[PDB]
Paper text:
Here we present three cryo-EM structures of the complete Integrator: one bound to the PEC in the pre-termination state; one bound to Pol II in the post-termination state; and one of the complete, free complex in an inactive state. In brief, we mixed four purified subcomplexes; namely, a tetrameric subcomplex containing INTS10, INTS13, INTS14 and INTS15, hereafter called the tail module, the eight-subunit Integrator core, the cleavage module and PP2A.
We obtained a cryo-EM reconstruction at an overall resolution of 4.1 Å. However, we observed a large additional density that emerges from the N terminus of the Integrator subunit INTS5 and runs around the Integrator cleavage module towards the upstream DNA. The ‘sting’ at the end of the tail is formed by the INTS13–INTS14 dimer. The sting projects towards the upstream DNA and it is positioned by INTS10, the INTS14 vWA domain and the INTS13 cleavage module binding motif (CMBM)34.
Residue numbers in the entry:
A (entry chain w): 57 to 66, 74 to 105, 108 to 401, 405 to 566, 574 to 586
B (entry chain A): 530 to 769
C (entry chain A): 1299 to 1484
D (entry chain v): 4 to 36, 38 to 82, 86 to 180, 187 to 332, 338 to 388, 408 to 432, 438 to 455, 458 to 471, ...
E (entry chain A): 866 to 1102, 1117 to 1154
F (entry chain E): 2 to 210
Write the structure that this text describes.
């Protein structure tokens, strides 16, 4: 062998023949020779496949066993591991090796040093990050910086890898609801991080995670026993019990304002959305008046929070929004047609923002019901024209409008005729192009690019989309938009079938 | 069709569904009376399902006595929810709707046409396959005799009360019908005044008739769903 | 423009698994592709197969005679099996494949499409008495008398008319007395 | 150990056991004093603390890198890069221990089949001496230079030619001989002995083996040729078919002759190929050897005789079957005795002109039941055809019409023919063999007992 | 009255009254239609990764293999190169069977009609022998391999040692052999069912007996049986059932609704306008 | 249309090469799967007046077993083939040692040509083929199982094994599309291999009548 050969100044005789086999002979000489030979045969791939051959043989080692008893590691393993972690495949491998045997002093002790030594972004740290404080805080800093510079689209991409880390236990959740709340309380960009905090809270609500007990004490809404106790039962139970609504109604109406952020919690307003805008919700007159008053109060008043004092209130816009919510409630609950006759005032209610997601949810609970398109006969259903007006008047609902609308586009209505199925898809594409004119450009075209390049949807719908887009838009064009749109027309499954000349003339000038 | 041509029918089928329910508990004397209509009985009275306070046997025990030898089956009852086999309680049925026979014993499940009728893979089919033909003949006769003699106790009828529903259900039926007639009137107005656009692949009469048929089919489906949802477990139409 | 004896053609996105295209992926799974198909009224199978952008492998037909003329005898056998199965399955019931296969093979074992009528069944050399039992008894018997056709009495029907034990189930063999086995008797 | 490049610790560093103060293998000198720089040498200290499993690690990496080395040869196989890769493999493959005929085996599989200076001559000679694993390169180069395939394969190959000739020399009464498709016993190994450039290798070794067979026995040359030569063109190799002038043509002609004995159409092609000029000297002799040397021609001749008699039955007269049969018999008879020279033997007026009425005599006499010309044709032609025709005629004017022909054939006598095992098998061991002893006829001793 | 004298003869071939061959085997596998059951092929549906994970025996993970087997069997499986080679050869054989099945059924339905219900039989063997699924088993996987091989050699539909009869036998029992190898795999026996040696021998005997019982007997008037089988549903019930059946049967040069099913190429089939 | 006719002729040649491959004739792989652009570049792209006329597309090929057995694939100019053109084509058939040939007709030829075909059968085996028939390969249809022509020795072995008569087998017509595809005459047997959902796969044999 290399070590068991001449143990003494000979040393076994059988091992001296074993020494002839390896030593500085073929095992060592031909290593450099073939390392230069496979290189000369073709090659940077040679060292990569060499490392792959080593890496496969590395994994067999029993690292968690022998490393526990040492307890010292000669000062953070400087001889061999400290130079090793600077290697990409090795440092990546160490994360894989840790997952095999967790709950060990050696592995959790060693990982605390590599996180700050160059591996700022610790990939596949779903469970390993939870055990160590330093690594968890470091990767949280990386996550918050990444989401902050990512913009808006990355929120879909940033949610799963980041928020799932707090699912192992609540102790990793309330701490992950602490420092960024301090960042949110400041006036210097305190809105966006509270936005991602509430988004995390809503994901917690749809993953069964209990977020109803911690977010109320975090927005200093626990200052009053009645307010916190009232809201706690609503968010924990998930319903509009009358007692809490009555105390809130008689509380906030008095000259003692609670913190405005407690009545503006998105989970609470989404709960109101679900409880009220459903067609099948039947409420008496008085409780309905209190409900519409709470929503109007939650969406009208401007308040100056000086942390000890506040003197500001508005009543007129509260009354106007109460009227709008009440009238839309009447339209939603009555359901009968005379639906077309009610658009004289319904678009006036569309102009108010608080009503827009209400009718959006009502439309979602209407169109998603099967046979609705089968029961419909118009060239364009009135509900989709309502979403067109919603897209026109406002832009904050555009991700939600697109999410509902692609949910409809991907849907198969087997009960319908095939040609009316296509005409329904073309109607949804008419909403796509309408929303494209209202500023929601990149996510829609990204959906189209995914649906065409990857999926196998009908090419006629894509062709109708491109024709409508080219016929509705005019130059100038931004470089990102032409960067996204141009591979569609270059697919050649569309170009030969029929604006096109103008677009190809302008795009080459653009790039 | 490689399935049994003959199976349990009518009175015996309804009564064996009513018999294998989880709530059926038989007194001692009733068990004595039923046990002697078994031609294949070994003469050993089984230990009761419930010993104290009162000795009560279940219909599953008696049907386990009827089932011959050690045939093994899994069958799905008609009222079995589809989502039950995905979530919790998948193999401990809250509805007793998963039939599994293990070692020739009905450990759980309610029996119907899907497990005792002509369908392939039913209890009689595997009983024939695993135990010849004479054993299955005895199986048929034992089911009929025991189940009819228990139907003397349970009884089974049908009447006017099973064809009626409360005021709420009839109000819902009338509202659904009224809305359907309103939709048909609206479609008629659209066709007459020419707001209605013909769909491709057919003429204007075909489009109008297809839409009317869709509306009335939706009305029938909704009314049937409302009526069935309004039924009670004691409804005899539902039992049949 | 187009092809004669083809009145109307309808596109269709099939929902049924049998007509939907199914392709094994690289991963080895089965993926059903909702691809367009056409259903016509009127059959000109050959021209349609020869047409452009039309899959010749999967393009089949309802008609039985013309698919025999175009594609052959084994193709019409398989197509007839498929059509018969479709008819039975539309009812929602099930019939074992053996009986469908036996019907298709019996009516395609002579090369041509043996119609189950007076015109196919009575043209085979099954024997005068079986044919007379089936239909047009007098015509078959007079033709046999003219042509001196002899009935070898190998079918069940002939022996049934003559009252002899048929070559059917319990009569497809003989019983011989085992005289040596009788030596153990008492 | 390291018998190439240099020497640091492959010999003196190979033996760590010598005296009292001579310890020093190379497990401490090798690597330190791994693969390359520390970045990739960092796995060594970490793995050396794990009980030192260094041998399986090193040999596993070497094995994986050698297998991956073999695959990249296809990139240059499909050649400036090929020359450099071959040179690198040769430099790395000059040592023992490592590259166990995988590197030099790969390089020889690429372009080192034919002999080369320092690539195929030295490497092939050493591989043949050491019995290396470069079987394709070893066989192709030994066959090219007459070292192993031509030289060392000339002993078993030349003796196998005679052994095969004796193997099908039996005189039984011939038990369903296999066709060219089923004649592949040792055909794969013999045809693959010169996979690289066996046109020259078959010219010297196989051609020399054939020339030795013609100087060894009448059956030896044809027996080995008939099996391999026809099937080689079916191997899908251009050189195998193109080596002979019409090997791809006459091999398929022979195979279809044995497939369908009666081949009136094929007789026109055979007469066109064998009846041509401008290549008479070498080509005519080679065609005679391939036409009459092979035992399959002898087995075909009996069917040709019977078909000629059947054809003459309809005409009932004598002067293309007779001309074709006489041409084949003359070519076969002249192949054994006459050398491969122009003005080929056969084509005598007496044999060809007599055998036609001799064959027609069976047709004329047989119908009258309900000839000197046969004897003249038998005397004019070779005795082997007469023996085969008489044997085939055994299986009532039909038996008496072909009589004089075969009788005069045997009486006249001969050349290379198949009238022993083929003849007797158409229709004290000495008692039956007494009649057959004159014919050579073979059915008397072996045919009677074995039948 | 058409297929009246169509009977399966004593050479297992189906022939009519004048001994013309209708089928060399009655169902094309010589099995009667009453002792045959619906069964699921566990190999046609899953992906390559899933098929390998659920059907390839792994002899490299000592821990889990020791969990599911007795330690002596663990040592025998690990030490033997011959046993590991045989297990891998069985896996490759069932992979060939998998691609053959994919060829046979381009539609991905695993429901087939085969004589012996293997899943219920394994359940019966488990229940009779009081198999504990929690404990490791005493069943040698190589015993499973050789038992399956010998069982395949025992289920005979075509008799004869000639190449033609052997080919016909391999083709007639192809589907059941694939199903038998798939169900009675070494990996499945080890992990999913946990049978014992006596239980495995009983299972093999039961499968052989039941398959032998399911063969179509000589003398069955399968013509009359087929006619009744096709006639009774017809009496029970764009063309509806009975007239379409009449058009199929009475070979009509004009049907009421002649039709084509034009399948398009891939590029056109995805586009509605060029469709 | 010019391009339409070029494509149709290319498809005809593709089906003919597949035919010759199936019949056991030595066809080069590149020509067996040549592209339409390969055909257009090779032959001239202009059948209306330019070089790729029908006689420029004549195909000759020899059997893999014997080079002597060659099949000719003819392409006449006229749609309705008269006696004169088959006569001169048969003279070309005479002057070479060929045995059997093919004729590809756009339109049905005169009946007298068919009678001439029937009477000249023993000397040479010439077969016609409508252009529409060869416009698509038939063996690739899902309904058509694979057909294998079996040799005389294989048929005798089959007949002996099953101990049945020649007439007791199932039958296929001589004018059947696949029988014409394999060019099999009376008395020839073709084995059919089809997959069955009951047994996996099944072999059937059919005599030609």
């Amino acid at each position: 062998i290399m070590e068991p050969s001449i143990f003494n100044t000979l040393g076994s005789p059988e091992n001296v023949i074993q020494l002839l086999s390896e030593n500085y002979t073929a095992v060592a000489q031909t290593v450099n020779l073939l390392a230069e030979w496979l290189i000369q045969t073709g090659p940077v791939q040679v060292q990569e496949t060499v490392e792959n051959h080593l890496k496969s043989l590395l994994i067999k080692h029993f690292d968690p066993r022998k490393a526990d008893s040492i307890f010292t590691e000669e000062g953070e393993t400087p001889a061999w591991l400290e130079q090793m972690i600077a290697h990409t495949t090795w440092r990546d491998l160490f994360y894989k090796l840790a997952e095999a045997h967790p709950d060990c002093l050696m592995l959790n002790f060693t990982v605390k040093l590599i996180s700050d030594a160059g591996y700022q972004g610790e990939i596949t740290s779903v469970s390993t990050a939870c055990q160590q404080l330093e690594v968890f805080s470091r990767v949280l800093r990386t996550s918050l910086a990444t989401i902050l510079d990512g913009g808006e689209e990355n929120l879909e991409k940033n949610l799963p890898e980041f928020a799932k880390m707090v699912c192992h236990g609540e102790h990793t959740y309330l701490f992950a609801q602490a420092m960024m709340s301090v960042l949110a309380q400041e006036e210097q960009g305190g809105s966006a991080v509270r936005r991602i905090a509430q988004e995390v809270q809503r994901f917690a609500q749809e993953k069964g995670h209990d977020a109803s007990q911690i977010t109320l004490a975090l927005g200093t809404a626990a200052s009053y026993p009645r307010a916190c106790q009232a809201l706690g039962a609503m968010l924990s139970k998930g319903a509009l019990n009358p007692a809490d609504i009555t105390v809130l109604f008689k509380m906030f109406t008095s000259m003692d304002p609670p913190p405005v952020e407690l009545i503006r919690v998105p989970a609470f307003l989404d709960l109101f959305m679900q409880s009220l805008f459903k067609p099948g919700a039947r409420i008496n007159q008085d409780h309905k008046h209190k409900y519409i008053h709470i929503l109007a109060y939650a969406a009208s008043v401007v308040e100056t929070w000086k942390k000890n004092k506040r003197v500001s209130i508005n009543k007129d816009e509260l009354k106007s929004t109460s009227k709008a919510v009440e009238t839309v409630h009447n339209l939603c609950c009555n359901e009968n047609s005379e639906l077309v006759a009610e658009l004289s005032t319904l678009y006036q209610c569309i102009r108010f923002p608080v009503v827009a997601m209400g009718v959006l949810k009502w439309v979602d609970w209407t169109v998603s019901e099967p046979r609705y398109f089968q029961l419909q006969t118009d060239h364009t259903p009135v509900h989709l024209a309502l979403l067109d007006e919603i897209s026109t008047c406002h832009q904050l609902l555009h991700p939600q409008v697109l999410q509902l609308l692609v949910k409809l586009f991907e849907t198969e209505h087997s009960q319908l005729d095939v040609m009316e199925q296509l005409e329904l898809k073309k109607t949804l594409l008419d909403r796509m192009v309408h929303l494209l004119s209202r500023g929601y450009v990149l996510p829609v075209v990204s959906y189209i690019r995914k649906c065409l390049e990857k999926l196998d949807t009908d090419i006629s719908l894509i062709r109708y989309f491109v024709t409508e887009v080219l016929d509705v838009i005019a130059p100038p064009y931004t470089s990102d938009f032409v960067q996204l749109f141009l591979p569609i027309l270059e697919n050649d499954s569309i170009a030969g079938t029929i604006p096109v000349t103008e677009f190809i003339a302008h795009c080459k000038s653009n790039f | 069709s490689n399935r049994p041509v003959m199976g349990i029918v009518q009175d015996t089928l309804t009564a064996v569904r009513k018999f294998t329910k989880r709530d059926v508990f038989l007194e001692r004397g009733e068990v004595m009376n039923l046990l002697m209509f078994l031609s294949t009985w070994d003469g050993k009275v089984p230990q009761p399902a419930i010993l104290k306070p009162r000795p009560l046997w279940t219909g599953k025990q008696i049907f386990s006595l009827i089932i011959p030898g050690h045939i093994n089956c899994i069958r799905t009852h008609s009222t079995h929810p589809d989502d039950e086999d995905s979530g919790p309680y998948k193999h401990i049925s809250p509805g007793d709707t998963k039939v599994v026979v293990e070692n020739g014993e009905l450990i759980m499940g309610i029996l119907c046409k899907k497990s005792l009728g002509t369908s392939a893979g039913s209890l009689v089919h595997i009983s024939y396959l695993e135990m010849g033909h004479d054993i299955t003949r005895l199986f048929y006769s034992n089911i009929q005799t025991v189940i009819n003699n228990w139907l003397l106790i349970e009884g089974h009828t049908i009447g006017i009360g099973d064809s009626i529903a409360d005021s709420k259900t009839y109000q819902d039926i009338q509202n659904t019908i009224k809305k359907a007639k309103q939709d048909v009137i609206e479609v008629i107005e659209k066709a007459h005044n020419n707001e209605l656009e013909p769909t491709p692949g057919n003429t204007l009469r075909q489009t109008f008739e297809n839409q009317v048929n869709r509306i009335l089919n939706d009305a029938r489906d909704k009314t049937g769903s409302s009526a069935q949802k309004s039924l009670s477990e004691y409804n005899n139409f539902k039992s049949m | 423009q187009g092809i004669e004896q083809i009145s109307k053609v309808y596109m269709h996105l099939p929902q049924t698994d049998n007509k939907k295209k199914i392709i094994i992926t690289e991963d080895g799974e089965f993926k059903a592709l909702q691809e367009w198909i056409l259903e016509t009224d009127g059959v000109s199978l050959m021209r349609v197969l020869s047409e452009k952008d039309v899959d010749p492998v999967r393009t089949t037909s309802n008609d039985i005679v013309e698919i025999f003329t175009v594609l052959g005898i084994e193709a019409v056998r398989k197509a007839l099996e498929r059509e018969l199965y479709h008819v039975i399955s539309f009812d929602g019931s099930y019939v074992n494949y053996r009986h469908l296969a036996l019907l298709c093979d019996t009516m395609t074992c002579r090369g041509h499409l043996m119609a189950i009528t007076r015109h196919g069944v009575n043209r085979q050399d099954t024997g005068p008495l079986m044919k007379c039992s089936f239909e047009e008894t007098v015509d078959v018997l007079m033709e046999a008398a003219a042509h001196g056709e002899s009935d070898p009495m190998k079918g069940v029907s002939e022996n049934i008319m003559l009252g002899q034990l048929a070559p059917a189930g319990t009569g497809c063999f003989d019983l011989l007395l085992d005289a040596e086995k009788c030596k153990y008797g008492m | 150990x390291x018998x190439x490049x240099x020497x640091x610790x492959x010999x003196x560093x190979x033996x760590x056991x010598x005296x009292x103060x001579x310890x020093x293998x190379x497990x401490x000198x090798x690597x330190x004093x791994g693969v390359l720089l520390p970045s990739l040498q960092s796995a060594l200290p970490f793995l050396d603390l794990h009980g030192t499993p260094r041998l399986e690690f090193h040999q596993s990496v070497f094995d994986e890198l050698r297998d991956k080395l073999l695959e990249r040869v296809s990139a240059i196989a499909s050649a400036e890069e090929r020359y450099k890769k071959l040179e690198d493999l040769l430099e790395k493959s000059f040592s023992l221990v490592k590259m166990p005929s995988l590197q030099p085996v790969v390089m020889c599989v690429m372009k080192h089949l034919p002999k080369v200076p320092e690539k195929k001559l030295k490497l092939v000679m050493a591989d043949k001496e050491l019995y290396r694993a470069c079987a394709v390169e070893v066989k192709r180069q030994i066959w090219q230079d007459n070292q192993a395939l031509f030289g060392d394969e000339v002993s078993p190959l030349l003796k196998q030619y005679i052994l095969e000739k004796e193997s099908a020399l039996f005189s039984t009464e011939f038990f369903s001989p296999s066709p060219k498709t089923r004649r592949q016993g040792e055909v794969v190994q013999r045809l693959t002995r010169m996979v690289g450039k066996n046109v020259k290798l078959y010219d010297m070794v196989l051609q020399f083996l054939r020339t030795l067979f013609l100087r060894t026995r009448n059956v030896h040359y044809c027996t080995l040729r008939a099996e391999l030569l026809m099937s080689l063109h079916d191997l899908d190799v251009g050189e195998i078919c193109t080596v002979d002038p019409c090997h791809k043509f006459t091999w398929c002609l022979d195979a279809c002759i044995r497939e369908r004995f009666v081949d009136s159409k094929r007789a026109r092609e055979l007469q066109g190929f064998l009846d041509g000029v401008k290549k008479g000297q070498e080509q005519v002799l080679g065609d005679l050897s391939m036409i009459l040397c092979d035992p399959f021609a002898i087995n075909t001749l009996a069917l040709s005789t019977v078909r000629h008699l059947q054809e003459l039955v309809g005409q009932e007269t004598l002067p293309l079957l007779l001309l074709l049969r006489l041409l084949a018999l003359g070519q076969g008879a002249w192949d054994m005795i006459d050398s491969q020279v122009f003005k080929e033997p056969k084509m005598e007026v007496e044999l060809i002109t007599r055998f036609l009425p001799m064959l027609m005599s069976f047709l004329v006499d047989d119908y009258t039941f309900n000839p000197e010309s046969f004897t003249k044709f038998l005397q004019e032609q070779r005795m082997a055809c007469e023996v085969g025709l008489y044997y085939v005629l055994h299986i009532k004017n039909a038996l008496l019409r072909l009589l004089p022909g075969l009788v005069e054939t045997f009486g006249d006598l001969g050349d290379i023919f198949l009238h022993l095992l083929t003849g007797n098998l158409a229709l004290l061991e000495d008692f039956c063999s007494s009649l057959f002893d004159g014919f050579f006829r073979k059915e008397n001793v072996h045919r009677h007992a074995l039948r | 009255k058409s297929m009246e004298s169509v009977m399966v003869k004593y050479d297992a071939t189906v022939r009519n009254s004048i001994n013309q061959v209708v089928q060399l085997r009655y169902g094309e596998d010589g099995l009667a239609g009453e002792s045959v059951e619906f069964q699921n092929l566990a190999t046609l549906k899953p992906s390559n990764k899933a098929f390998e994970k659920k059907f390839r025996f792994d002899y490299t993970n000592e821990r889990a293999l020791r969990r599911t087997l007795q330690e002596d069997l663990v040592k025998d499986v690990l030490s033997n190169a011959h046993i590991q080679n045989e297990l891998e050869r069985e896996f490759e054989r069932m992979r060939e069977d998998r691609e053959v099945l994919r060829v046979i059924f381009p539609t991905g339905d695993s429901k087939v009609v085969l004589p012996c219900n293997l899943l219920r039989m394994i359940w019966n063997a488990q229940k009779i022998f009081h198999i504990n699924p929690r404990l490791p088993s005493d069943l040698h996987p190589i015993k499973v391999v050789e038992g399956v091989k010998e069982l395949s050699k025992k289920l005979v539909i075509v008799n004869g040692d000639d190449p033609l009869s052997r080919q016909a036998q391999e083709n007639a029992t192809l589907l059941f052999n694939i199903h038998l190898r798939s169900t009675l795999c070494s990996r499945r026996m080890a992990e999913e069912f946990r049978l014992s040696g006596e239980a495995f021998d009983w299972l093999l005997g039961e499968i052989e007996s039941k398959f032998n019982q399911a063969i179509a007997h000589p003398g069955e008037m399968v013509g009359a049986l087929a006619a009744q089988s096709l006639g009774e549903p017809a009496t029970q019930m764009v063309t509806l059932g009975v007239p379409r059946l009449k058009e199929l049967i009475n070979i009509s040069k004009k049907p009421k609704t002649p039709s084509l099913t034009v399948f398009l190429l891939g590029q056109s089939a995805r586009d509605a306008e060029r469709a | 249309d010019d391009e339409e006719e070029t494509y149709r002729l290319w498809k005809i040649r593709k089906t003919i090469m597949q035919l010759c491959h199936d019949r056991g004739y030595l066809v080069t792989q590149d020509e067996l799967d040549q592209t339409l652009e390969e055909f257009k570049a090779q032959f001239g792209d202009k059948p209306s007046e330019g070089r790729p006329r029908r006689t420029d597309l004549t195909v000759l090929v020899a059997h893999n077993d014997d080079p002597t057995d060659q099949m000719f694939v003819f392409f006449p100019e006229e749609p309705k083939v008269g006696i004169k053109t088959i006569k001169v084509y048969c003279q070309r058939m005479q002057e070479e040692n060929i045995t059997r040939a093919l004729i590809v007709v756009q339109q049905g030829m005169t009946p007298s040509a068919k009678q001439s075909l029937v009477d000249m059968a023993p000397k040479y085996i010439l077969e016609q083929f409508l252009q529409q028939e060869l416009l698509i390969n038939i063996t690739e249809h899902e309904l058509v199982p694979e057909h294998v022509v079996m040799t005389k020795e294989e048929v005798t072995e089959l007949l002996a094994r099953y101990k049945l008569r020649e007439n007791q087998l199932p039958r296929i017509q001589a004018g059947d599309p696949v029988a014409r595809y394999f060019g099999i005459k009376r008395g020839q047997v073709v084995k059919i291999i089809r997959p069955s959902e009951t047994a996996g796969r099944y072999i059937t044999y059919r005599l030609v009548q």
